[PDB]
Design a protein around this ligand. Structure first.
Ligand SMILES: O=P(O)(O)OC[C@H]1O[C@](O)(CO)[C@@H](O)[C@@H]1O
Ligand SMILES: O=P(O)(O)OC[C@H]1O[C@](O)(CO)[C@@H](O)[C@@H]1O
Ligand SMILES: O=P(O)(O)OC[C@H]1O[C@](O)(CO)[C@@H](O)[C@@H]1O
Ligand SMILES: O=P(O)(O)OC[C@H]1O[C@](O)(CO)[C@@H](O)[C@@H]1O
Ligand SMILES: [Zn+2]
Ligand SMILES: [Zn+2]
Ligand SMILES: [Zn+2]
Ligand SMILES: [Zn+2]
Ligand SMILES: [Zn+2]
Ligand SMILES: [Zn+2]
Ligand SMILES: [Zn+2]
Ligand SMILES: [Zn+2]
Ligand SMILES: [Zn+2]
Ligand SMILES: [Zn+2]
Ligand SMILES: [Zn+2]
Ligand SMILES: [Zn+2]
Lengths: 328, 328, 328, 328
């Protein structure tokens, strides 16, 4: 009878600061979009939402039907929030500038639907976002989305798994909210989340062993064959960045999508995939790197820019960095 | 307005045979239990269902809270179906014999909740079952559950992923039904499913490389480094047998949980995990083996017996068998 | 964890009899249709289901959109149940004969949607049904629907109120099941319901005072001005037969829709409105009359036949009959 | 994909004014409470929420279980909205003053659960509220709730009928939003509602005929026996102020709960029942009177004060006033 919704939670924090409150609006409208996607996904096969949309995004991805629905849902809700000015979506060629009448001081980068390969086999998928505060007075433009992750004021992701979860990270920390299907409210379930210092799980697509670099290769062998005769790490790779990362967060361990010989900048997109997760990861006492630099310190040059990403437990991520260092 | 529920579907088939119909009852009651688990899982964090139950099953697993709830749900519904006589659950030491008043001619083996390691990180989990028809007139006993998988008249699994799915395989084939949250009915979504002849995905926990046997080791290297200069298979390992298998079914490919140097009989349990999946896999044109024999031809000696299991696309599974043959 | 669904309940009873079980199928399929209507009604305004269908039924009613959807839903589910042979709907001119391949021994009369006037103002509405067992071997025809209510083997109604309820009456009694929105199962909530001997509520449309007959007129005055200086009955008239009747059942009292000077046979339809309610009412220790004969003893001559109906608490209904007797 | 939620709608209006926005917060938090009540009511029988709470409110009502749950839900959500300072509930003896830390400029009067007599028979029930803006700087107190209805800045009610509806009236008009069970969002369904000039339905409890006054008595006879030989009005009385009023709004007509010889001030409570409805009614082109004065012009003297109330279509309400005038 005393529901601790994400809305009550956020205001509860932003109360002290006493801002315009358009963030609470922003997140509220984001939650609405997140609930409709969750509901659409929960019945995609029956609703006939499986298949392709018949188009290709800048990243060359084959646009799916749930990419469109989720992209629209999110774009519309953000525009109607009267809290955003510039929007960047993986599904949109250029930055979406918000019409003057509904402009807000926030710039949001988002991956409408993450885990494309797992939509048809009911494997966990989600929505990733990053929120920057327009750091200028110039007329709103794509340039406002080209900020380093360190500039995020908030970020997180919606996880449509066996249960729908909204993980939200801000300046002071990370919190997980679970969508109560009954009343459609994200209830707090994990307060001030902290990833452990060291895990026992490594996740990466090992189908790319031939293209892996010396560092990645050694770290993996090290995971399978520990030098100190300790138990080898277990392995897990769902295939949806959102699902594996989230598991990293609550179970500890490491997630990797490094670059190979075919891709200098890895595969995941910096703006809407890496930075959000890097932000979340850091606000939970974790680390997120490319192998040679902190993902959040990268200054973008392209809204659809890619970047290698190694994240998770401090000690695990450091061990890999130490190896990249030895190989450099 | 002309809903094609699993119930209408099953009767639609069993109509010709004209049996007692206790199977339709069996599946109906199984669907009820499957909906409550799905609903409980959808709110496990908010409902406080996360954690351990404080006990250990015969397999040595650390019993979780959702194991108990789901175990009870399924046990009660099966007893009330007036269609079962002997029940085997991974969570029960011995076979549950159904009281005379509610006895039926069916023997059901089930894994109340599969994917234990993925419950707390919202990763796909499910329920696996196998249904045998009591092949005798002797007084019902555990012996009735010790039949080879080839004797299954039906089997399948409930998949609590981003959407709840019920995959059902019977003598004539496999069909997927999706749970419409609106009216709580499993609607047909994939009719007469057939796994493809060859996939491009291999799933197995590679954290056990040191314990892998020569055959497994070679197959994997072969997947990463193709001898014919073809593209390497992608990798995926969710961590819940139900999720990976189901993906194998609709995407094609191969799933493996072989034996190592520590486990002669692998890890998955024959009665409620392997046979069901082996049945499903075969009814879809696929294969399921231990590395040296068809999983369905194994005659059990213990209701909690383990067995190695390699399943999926015909050509992929054969290639591995050919290797096991070369190494023998 | 030990859900007492209507399905478990019905089998629980019909177990003793040991019939073909097509009744449990019948009710199961009826429950599916009842859940979709409930779900459609719950979002009729948002779904755009409000309005007219553009047609007139035999009774001259202006067919609504939810009449069609609900009519189809029910007709299809009954046909797919393999348990019915002749179907009578208020929305269908003639009796629907079930194609041989899906025929069953049951004849079902139903009011797809009751309370037409209350659909647009969100007032309680529902579905009424009566089930007769084909009492012959002749080729199925409309004649099989022209039986007296005393021949009902089961009957009841779905009530889409602030909660969706399914009231089911059979030879041994009445029971109320409530639709759990979570898992879409009608759970038992009121076992073996018995209406009280005398209520303190009278329900009837008093807008027809000018057309009321001497008996109705006197009974009403008597309700407002008690001869024994006792408290006057309270008044309640929702406007949907299903809602008022159901309230009569659990609160006691009396419901009336007598004939006037304009209608010799009242307004409600005998086959799908009066008999079901009369059956329910009697199985709960109540009474249902026309003012001069028991509604259940009327032998129909037309499937869309009307009949006056006074029902509810024994003593209240008797008092009115005594008045009709004095006026005759 | 472009959902028109109540939240988007309200901001859409309040945008021009450019206020603190605590109203949008107020309504948001009110919507959360409204969804949980709706969900609790939808399963009250199964949840065991039927019965009494074991207590009596100031009005002498026998407190029900859903009164408590709904009262708490609403009280907590309003306190957590950081938008209210003084709260008045029918279930609370005195005005609830909001602790300084969470104070807002709004005073809210509410009927946590309206239609007490119809909870157990699944008849439509709801939640009524009125929102006043603290018109002073004095320290918050009960005096702030003793304002005339004309001072309302907003008001409305939640209707838990066959569908859950939220009717919201503000300075510029009335709008109906329907709760989409799928995503838990109140979607706009009836924009700028206007009650018709004259209806053909009268609603009142005629069980109180003996206690009715000369005016009420004549109006009713006039409704049953039209002086101009026109068709008599139909009659409808659900028994829950919220349900009948709402029907008046969309169907036109008249609703009455006048005073009798036993009650000089009728029965409904001025603060949380009459004023809200009177406000709604007026903002829709309708009228709301006591029989001798506009309900909204009454200056309260007691937060649990009662007042007679006649509302609905202009011409119908005027006709009754003309009669009260002739009898005075
Ligand atoms: O199949 P691959 O190359 O391992 O890519 C998997 C990655 O693809 C993504 O869908 C990004 O496109 C991520 O969600 C996931 O981590
Ligand atoms: O962590 P591991 O050893 O790879 O085990 C994973 C397997 O465990 C199980 O939960 C069985 O206990 C399966 O669902 C899953 O495939
Ligand atoms: O408006 P009237 O004449 O009172 O009719 C009300 C009756 O109409 C019905 O809708 C039947 O058509 C019943 O549900 C209800 O009892
Ligand atoms: O039974 P009565 O005296 O007609 O009272 C009905 C009224 O009671 C209320 O519940 C108020 O207590 C209203 O919702 C309804 O209009
Ligand atoms: Zn993509
Ligand atoms: Zn995407
Ligand atoms: Zn992505
Ligand atoms: Zn286990
Ligand atoms: Zn298990
Ligand atoms: Zn398992
Ligand atoms: Zn009709
Ligand atoms: Zn009808
Ligand atoms: Zn009807
Ligand atoms: Zn009360
Ligand atoms: Zn109340
Ligand atoms: Zn009230």
């Amino acid at each position: 009878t005393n529901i601790v919704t994400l809305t009550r939670f956020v205001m509860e924090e932003g109360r002290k600061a006493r801002g315009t409150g358009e963030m609470t609006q922003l997140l509220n409208s984001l939650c609405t979009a997140v609930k409709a996607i969750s509901t659409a996904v929960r019945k995609a096969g029956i609703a006939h939402l499986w298949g392709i949309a018949g188009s290709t995004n800048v990243t060359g991805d084959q646009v799916k039907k749930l990419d469109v629905l989720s992209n629209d849902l999110v774009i519309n809700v953000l525009k109607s929030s009267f809290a955003t000015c510039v929007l960047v979506s993986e599904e949109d060629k250029n930055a979406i500038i918000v019409e003057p009448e509904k402009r807000g001081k926030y710039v949001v980068c988002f991956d409408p639907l993450d885990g494309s390969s797992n939509i048809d086999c009911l494997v966990s998928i989600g929505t990733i976002f990053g929120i920057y505060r327009k750091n200028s007075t110039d007329e709103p433009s794509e340039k406002d989305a080209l900020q380093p992750g360190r500039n995020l004021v908030a970020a997180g992701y919606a996880l449509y798994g066996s249960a729908t979860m909204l993980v939200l990270a801000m300046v002071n920390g990370v919190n997980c909210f679970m969508l109560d299907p009954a009343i459609g409210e994200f209830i707090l379930v994990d307060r001030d989340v902290k990833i452990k210092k060291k895990g026992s799980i490594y996740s990466i697509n090992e189908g790319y062993a031939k293209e892996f670099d010396p560092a990645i290769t050694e770290y993996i062998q090290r995971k399978k064959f520990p030098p100190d005769n300790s138990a080898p790490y277990g392995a897990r790779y769902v295939g949806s960045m959102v699902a594996d990362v989230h598991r990293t967060l609550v179970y500890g361990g490491i997630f990797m999508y490094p670059a190979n010989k075919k891709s200098p900048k890895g595969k995941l997109r910096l703006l809407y995939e890496c930075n959000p997760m890097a932000y979340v990861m850091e606000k939970a006492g974790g680390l997120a790197t490319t192998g040679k630099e902190a993902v959040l310190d990268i200054v973008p040059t392209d809204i659809h820019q890619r970047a290698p990403i190694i994240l998770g437990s401090p000690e695990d991520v450091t061990e890999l960095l130490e190896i990249y260092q030895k190989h450099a």
